[PDB]
Protein backbone atom coordinates (compact mmCIF):
# COMPACT_ATOMS: atom_id res chain seq x y z
CA UNK A 1 0.00 0.00 0.00
CA UNK A 2 1.81 3.17 -1.14
CA UNK A 3 2.21 5.94 1.40
CA UNK A 4 -0.21 8.71 0.48
CA UNK A 5 1.60 12.01 0.17
CA UNK A 6 0.40 15.47 -0.63
CA UNK A 7 2.44 18.46 -1.80
CA UNK A 8 1.81 22.06 -0.91
CA UNK A 9 3.93 24.08 -3.35
CA UNK A 10 4.32 27.74 -4.25
CA UNK A 11 6.81 29.61 -6.41
CA UNK A 12 10.15 28.02 -7.35
CA UNK A 13 10.18 26.00 -4.14
CA UNK A 14 8.43 22.78 -5.38
CA UNK A 15 11.00 22.35 -8.17
CA UNK A 16 11.45 18.56 -8.55
CA UNK A 17 9.22 16.99 -5.83
CA UNK A 18 6.46 15.88 -8.19
CA UNK A 19 8.81 13.84 -10.41
CA UNK A 20 10.66 12.40 -7.42
CA UNK A 21 7.43 11.20 -5.81
CA UNK A 22 6.26 9.81 -9.17
CA UNK A 23 9.38 7.61 -9.42
CA UNK A 24 9.06 6.13 -5.90
CA UNK A 25 7.36 2.76 -5.85
CA UNK A 26 6.33 3.08 -2.18
CA UNK A 27 4.66 6.48 -2.34
CA UNK A 28 1.82 8.19 -4.25
CA UNK A 29 0.97 11.90 -4.75
CA UNK A 30 -2.71 11.91 -3.80
CA UNK A 31 -3.35 15.69 -3.56
CA UNK A 32 -1.51 18.75 -4.89
CA UNK A 33 -1.98 22.35 -3.84
CA UNK A 34 0.23 24.48 -6.15
CA UNK A 35 0.23 28.08 -7.46
CA UNK A 36 2.60 27.04 -10.21
CA UNK A 37 0.76 25.91 -13.42
CA UNK A 38 3.87 24.06 -14.65
CA UNK A 39 3.55 21.94 -11.45
CA UNK A 40 -0.20 21.42 -11.93
CA UNK A 41 0.61 19.98 -15.40
CA UNK A 42 2.53 17.09 -13.77
CA UNK A 43 0.00 15.37 -11.41
CA UNK A 44 -0.75 11.66 -11.71
CA UNK A 45 -4.34 10.75 -12.61
CA UNK A 46 -6.22 10.45 -9.36
CA UNK A 47 -4.27 13.23 -7.66
CA UNK A 48 -6.74 15.88 -6.43
CA UNK A 49 -5.96 19.49 -7.40
CA UNK A 50 -6.49 22.01 -4.63
CA UNK A 51 -6.40 25.75 -4.75
CA UNK A 52 -6.60 25.88 -0.91
CA UNK A 53 -3.75 24.30 1.10
CA UNK A 54 -6.21 23.74 3.96
CA UNK A 55 -7.97 21.05 1.90
CA UNK A 56 -4.72 19.09 1.73
CA UNK A 57 -4.36 18.96 5.54
CA UNK A 58 -8.09 18.20 6.07
CA UNK A 59 -7.87 15.29 3.64
CA UNK A 60 -8.65 11.95 5.31
CA UNK A 61 -6.51 9.84 2.96
CA UNK A 62 -3.37 12.01 3.11
CA UNK A 63 -0.79 10.39 5.38
CA UNK A 64 1.97 13.04 5.11
CA UNK A 65 2.51 16.55 3.69
CA UNK A 66 5.53 17.95 1.82
CA UNK A 67 5.69 21.73 2.40
CA UNK A 68 7.63 23.38 -0.48
CA UNK A 69 6.38 26.99 -0.11
CA UNK A 70 8.33 30.25 0.50
CA UNK A 71 9.92 29.92 3.96
CA UNK A 72 7.98 32.79 5.55
CA UNK A 73 4.89 30.55 5.10
CA UNK A 74 6.41 27.33 6.55
CA UNK A 75 5.38 27.79 10.18
CA UNK A 76 1.62 28.36 9.43
CA UNK A 77 1.29 25.35 7.13
CA UNK A 78 3.45 23.10 9.35
CA UNK A 79 1.47 23.93 12.47
CA UNK A 80 -1.77 23.12 10.55
CA UNK A 81 -0.38 19.84 9.31
CA UNK A 82 0.81 18.84 12.82
CA UNK A 83 -2.56 19.83 14.32
CA UNK A 84 -4.12 17.44 11.76
CA UNK A 85 -1.84 14.51 12.66
CA UNK A 86 0.01 14.45 9.31
CA UNK A 87 3.74 13.91 9.11
CA UNK A 88 5.65 16.84 7.54
CA UNK A 89 8.69 17.16 5.28
CA UNK A 90 9.37 20.88 5.03
CA UNK A 91 11.88 22.44 2.72
CA UNK A 92 14.85 24.37 4.23
CA UNK A 93 15.20 26.81 5.83
CA UNK A 94 12.73 25.58 8.45
CA UNK A 95 11.63 29.18 8.95
CA UNK A 96 13.20 32.62 8.67
CA UNK A 97 12.28 33.29 12.31
CA UNK A 98 13.40 31.63 15.57
CA UNK A 99 10.12 32.04 17.47
CA UNK A 100 8.21 30.33 14.59
CA UNK A 101 10.79 27.55 14.60
CA UNK A 102 10.25 27.14 18.34
CA UNK A 103 6.43 27.11 17.87
CA UNK A 104 6.79 24.28 15.42
CA UNK A 105 9.20 22.32 17.73
CA UNK A 106 6.63 22.68 20.56
CA UNK A 107 3.69 21.42 18.45
CA UNK A 108 5.69 18.40 17.20
CA UNK A 109 6.58 17.63 20.85
CA UNK A 110 2.98 18.10 22.15
CA UNK A 111 1.45 16.00 19.35
CA UNK A 112 4.27 13.48 18.63
CA UNK A 113 3.99 14.18 14.85
CA UNK A 114 7.07 13.35 12.76
CA UNK A 115 8.63 16.52 11.16
CA UNK A 116 11.71 16.30 8.96
CA UNK A 117 13.46 19.25 7.40
CA UNK A 118 14.69 18.80 3.79
CA UNK A 119 18.40 19.64 4.12
CA UNK A 120 19.43 17.94 0.96
CA UNK A 121 23.09 17.29 1.87
CA UNK A 122 22.08 15.23 4.85
CA UNK A 123 20.40 12.76 2.42
CA UNK A 124 23.35 12.71 -0.02
CA UNK A 125 25.19 9.37 -0.23
CA UNK A 126 28.49 11.25 -0.61
CA UNK A 127 27.97 13.03 2.79
CA UNK A 128 27.04 9.74 4.40
CA UNK A 129 30.25 8.23 2.86
CA UNK A 130 32.36 11.18 4.14
CA UNK A 131 30.99 10.75 7.66
CA UNK A 132 31.66 6.98 7.45
CA UNK A 133 35.35 7.72 6.66
CA UNK A 134 36.01 10.37 9.33
CA UNK A 135 38.31 8.12 11.44
CA UNK A 136 40.72 7.98 8.49
CA UNK A 137 41.49 11.72 8.77
CA UNK A 138 41.70 11.82 12.57
CA UNK A 139 40.66 14.63 14.82
CA UNK A 140 39.07 17.56 12.86
CA UNK A 141 41.11 20.78 12.73
CA UNK A 142 39.06 22.83 10.29
CA UNK A 143 36.06 22.78 8.02
CA UNK A 144 35.37 24.87 4.98
CA UNK A 145 32.70 25.11 2.30
CA UNK A 146 31.92 27.16 -0.78
CA UNK A 147 28.62 27.58 -2.68
CA UNK A 148 28.58 29.78 -5.74
CA UNK A 149 26.48 30.80 -8.72
CA UNK A 150 25.47 33.76 -10.84
CA UNK A 151 22.45 34.97 -8.91
CA UNK A 152 19.59 34.70 -9.38
CA UNK A 153 19.09 38.29 -8.42
CA UNK A 154 15.58 38.90 -7.09
CA UNK A 155 14.21 42.02 -5.41
CA UNK A 156 12.97 41.10 -1.90
CA UNK A 157 14.09 37.52 -2.48
CA UNK A 158 14.93 35.19 0.42
CA UNK A 159 18.39 36.37 1.51
CA UNK A 160 21.28 34.21 0.28
CA UNK A 161 22.51 33.83 3.93
CA UNK A 162 19.28 32.00 4.81
CA UNK A 163 18.53 30.24 1.57
CA UNK A 164 22.03 28.99 0.68
CA UNK A 165 23.33 29.20 4.26
CA UNK A 166 20.79 26.76 5.71
CA UNK A 167 22.14 24.19 3.25
CA UNK A 168 25.75 24.48 4.59
CA UNK A 169 24.94 25.28 8.23
CA UNK A 170 23.00 21.94 8.42
CA UNK A 171 26.13 20.13 7.17
CA UNK A 172 28.43 21.77 9.73
CA UNK A 173 26.08 21.13 12.71
CA UNK A 174 25.53 17.54 11.50
CA UNK A 175 29.33 16.99 11.31
CA UNK A 176 30.20 18.63 14.64
CA UNK A 177 27.37 17.15 16.76
CA UNK A 178 26.90 20.34 18.73
CA UNK A 179 26.19 24.02 18.43
CA UNK A 180 28.86 26.67 17.88
CA UNK A 181 30.45 28.69 20.72
CA UNK A 182 30.35 31.62 18.33
CA UNK A 183 28.86 32.63 14.99
CA UNK A 184 29.66 35.69 12.87
CA UNK A 185 29.30 36.74 9.25
CA UNK A 186 31.75 38.78 7.21
CA UNK A 187 30.83 40.40 3.93
CA UNK A 188 33.71 40.84 1.54
CA UNK A 189 31.50 42.57 -1.06
CA UNK A 190 27.81 43.52 -0.93
CA UNK A 191 25.77 45.46 -3.48
CA UNK A 192 22.63 45.26 -5.65
CA UNK A 193 22.26 43.71 -9.08
CA UNK A 194 18.94 43.96 -10.98
CA UNK A 195 17.34 45.17 -7.73
CA UNK A 196 18.50 42.00 -5.87
CA UNK A 197 21.36 41.46 -3.35
CA UNK A 198 24.66 40.61 -5.05
CA UNK A 199 27.58 39.61 -2.86
CA UNK A 200 30.13 37.47 -1.10
CA UNK A 201 29.83 36.47 2.57
CA UNK A 202 31.76 34.12 4.81
CA UNK A 203 30.11 32.64 7.93
CA UNK A 204 32.46 31.62 10.74
CA UNK A 205 31.19 29.10 13.30
CA UNK A 206 33.56 28.26 16.18
CA UNK A 207 33.55 24.91 17.96
CA UNK A 208 36.06 25.37 20.73
CA UNK A 209 39.37 25.31 18.82
CA UNK A 210 37.89 24.30 15.43
CA UNK A 211 36.40 26.81 12.97
CA UNK A 212 34.01 26.18 10.10
CA UNK A 213 34.13 28.83 7.36
CA UNK A 214 31.16 28.84 5.02
CA UNK A 215 31.48 30.95 1.89
CA UNK A 216 28.34 32.06 -0.04
CA UNK A 217 28.79 34.16 -3.20
CA UNK A 218 26.14 34.79 -5.90
CA UNK A 219 28.47 36.59 -8.34
CA UNK A 220 30.72 33.66 -9.43
CA UNK A 221 30.58 30.51 -11.53
CA UNK A 222 28.43 27.60 -10.30
CA UNK A 223 30.15 25.53 -7.63
CA UNK A 224 29.54 23.53 -4.45
CA UNK A 225 32.43 22.13 -2.49
CA UNK A 226 33.42 21.31 1.04
CA UNK A 227 36.55 20.02 2.75
CA UNK A 228 37.02 18.50 6.23
CA UNK A 229 40.60 18.92 7.45
CA UNK A 230 41.92 16.50 10.02
CA UNK A 231 45.25 15.61 11.60
CA UNK A 232 45.86 12.70 9.21
CA UNK A 233 43.97 13.55 5.99
CA UNK A 234 41.47 15.92 4.36
CA UNK A 235 38.06 14.85 2.97
CA UNK A 236 36.69 16.93 0.09
CA UNK A 237 33.33 16.85 -1.72
CA UNK A 238 33.51 18.87 -4.94
CA UNK A 239 30.97 19.23 -7.80
CA UNK A 240 33.60 20.07 -10.42
CA UNK A 241 35.56 16.87 -9.62
CA UNK A 242 35.19 13.53 -11.46
CA UNK A 243 34.78 11.99 -8.00
CA UNK A 244 32.15 12.90 -5.45
CA UNK A 245 34.40 12.13 -2.43
CA UNK A 246 38.22 12.31 -2.36
CA UNK A 247 40.85 11.57 0.31
CA UNK A 248 43.83 13.94 0.37
CA UNK A 249 46.88 14.38 2.59
CA UNK A 250 46.74 16.31 5.84
CA UNK A 251 47.24 20.06 5.92
CA UNK A 252 47.86 22.83 8.34
CA UNK A 253 46.87 25.75 5.97
CA UNK A 254 43.15 25.05 5.42
CA UNK A 255 43.54 25.69 1.70
CA UNK A 256 41.67 23.67 -0.86
CA UNK A 257 43.65 20.59 -1.74
CA UNK A 258 45.25 20.78 -5.16
CA UNK A 259 45.55 17.47 -6.99
CA UNK A 260 43.25 14.52 -7.67
CA UNK A 261 43.39 12.78 -4.29
CA UNK A 262 42.16 9.23 -3.67
CA UNK A 263 38.56 8.63 -4.82
CA UNK A 264 36.37 6.97 -2.17
CA UNK A 265 33.38 4.86 -3.20
CA UNK A 266 30.06 6.71 -3.27
CA UNK A 267 26.84 5.23 -4.60
CA UNK A 268 24.57 7.01 -7.01
CA UNK A 269 21.09 7.49 -5.49
CA UNK A 270 20.06 11.10 -5.93
CA UNK A 271 19.89 13.01 -2.67
CA UNK A 272 16.30 14.23 -3.18
CA UNK A 273 15.20 10.76 -4.18
CA UNK A 274 16.77 9.53 -0.93
CA UNK A 275 15.08 12.24 1.16
CA UNK A 276 11.57 11.50 -0.15
CA UNK A 277 12.12 7.68 -0.21
CA UNK A 278 13.30 7.63 3.41
CA UNK A 279 10.66 10.13 4.56
CA UNK A 280 7.80 8.19 2.93
CA UNK A 281 9.30 5.07 4.53
CA UNK A 282 9.20 6.51 8.01
CA UNK A 283 5.63 7.86 7.89
CA UNK A 284 3.97 4.69 9.25
CA UNK A 285 6.90 3.86 11.55
CA UNK A 286 8.18 7.21 12.66
CA UNK A 287 11.77 8.06 13.56
CA UNK A 288 13.83 11.23 13.87
CA UNK A 289 15.87 10.42 10.72
CA UNK A 290 19.00 12.20 9.42
CA UNK A 291 17.51 15.70 9.28
CA UNK A 292 15.12 16.19 12.20
CA UNK A 293 13.08 19.18 13.14
CA UNK A 294 15.49 19.93 16.04
CA UNK A 295 18.32 20.32 13.60
CA UNK A 296 16.19 22.70 11.48
CA UNK A 297 15.57 24.74 14.59
CA UNK A 298 19.29 24.86 15.49
CA UNK A 299 20.13 25.93 11.86
CA UNK A 300 17.57 28.77 12.18
CA UNK A 301 19.23 29.85 15.43
CA UNK A 302 22.66 30.11 13.84
CA UNK A 303 21.36 31.89 10.73
CA UNK A 304 19.68 34.53 12.90
CA UNK A 305 22.99 34.99 14.80
CA UNK A 306 24.70 35.81 11.45
CA UNK A 307 22.00 38.18 10.20
Instruction: Mark whether 63 and 179 lie in a shared domain.
Output: no
Report how many domains make up the chain.
2
Instruction: Mark whether 12 and 76 lie in a shared domain.
Output: yes
DSSP secondary structure code for residue 136 in this structure? H
State the CATH number of the domain containing residue 205: 3.30.360.10
Q: Which domain holds residue 154?
A: 124-268
β-sheet bridge partners, residue 226: 145, 237
Could you check whether the bond before residue 93 is cis, i.e. omega within 30 degrees of 0? yes
The pair phi, psi for residue 31, each rounded to 5°, is: -140, 155
Instruction: Mark whether 204 and 83 lie in a shared domain.
Output: no
Instruction: Mark whether 240 and 303 lie in a shared domain.
Output: no
Instruction: Mark whether 83 and 26 lie in a shared domain.
Output: yes
Resolution of the model in angstroms: 1.9
Residue 214 near residue 171 (C-beta atoms within 8 A): no
Which of 238, 253, 268 is the last residue in one of the domains?
268
Instruction: Mark whether 32 and 94 lie in a shared domain.
Output: yes
Instruction: Mark whether 204 and 243 lie in a shared domain.
Output: yes
CA nearest 72: which of 157, 129, 132?
A: 157
As a whole number of angstroms, the distance between CA 103 and CA 105 comes to: 6
State the CATH number of the domain containing residue 100: 3.40.50.720
Instruction: Mark whether 201 and 83 lie in a shared domain.
Output: no
Instruction: Mark whether 150 and 235 lie in a shared domain.
Output: yes
Give the method used: X-ray
Instruction: Mark whether 88 and 180 lie in a shared domain.
Output: no
Residues 6+ apart with CB under 8 A from 273: 20, 23, 24
Measured in whole angstroms, how far is the alpha carbon of residue 166 from the centre of its chain?
6
Q: Angle at Cα 128 formed by Cα 204 and Cα 63, nearest 5°?
A: 100
Amino acid sequence: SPVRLALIGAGRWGKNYIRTIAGLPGAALVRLASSNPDNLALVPPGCVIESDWRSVVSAPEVEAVIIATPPATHAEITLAAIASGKAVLVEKPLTLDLAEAEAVAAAAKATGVMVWVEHTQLFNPAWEALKADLTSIGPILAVRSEAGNHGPYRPGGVPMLWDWGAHDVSMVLDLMGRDPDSTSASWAARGEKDGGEAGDVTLTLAFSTVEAHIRLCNTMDKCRRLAVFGEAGTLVMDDRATDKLTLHPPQPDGNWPVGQGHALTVTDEMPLTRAVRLFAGAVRQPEPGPSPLELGLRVVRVLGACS
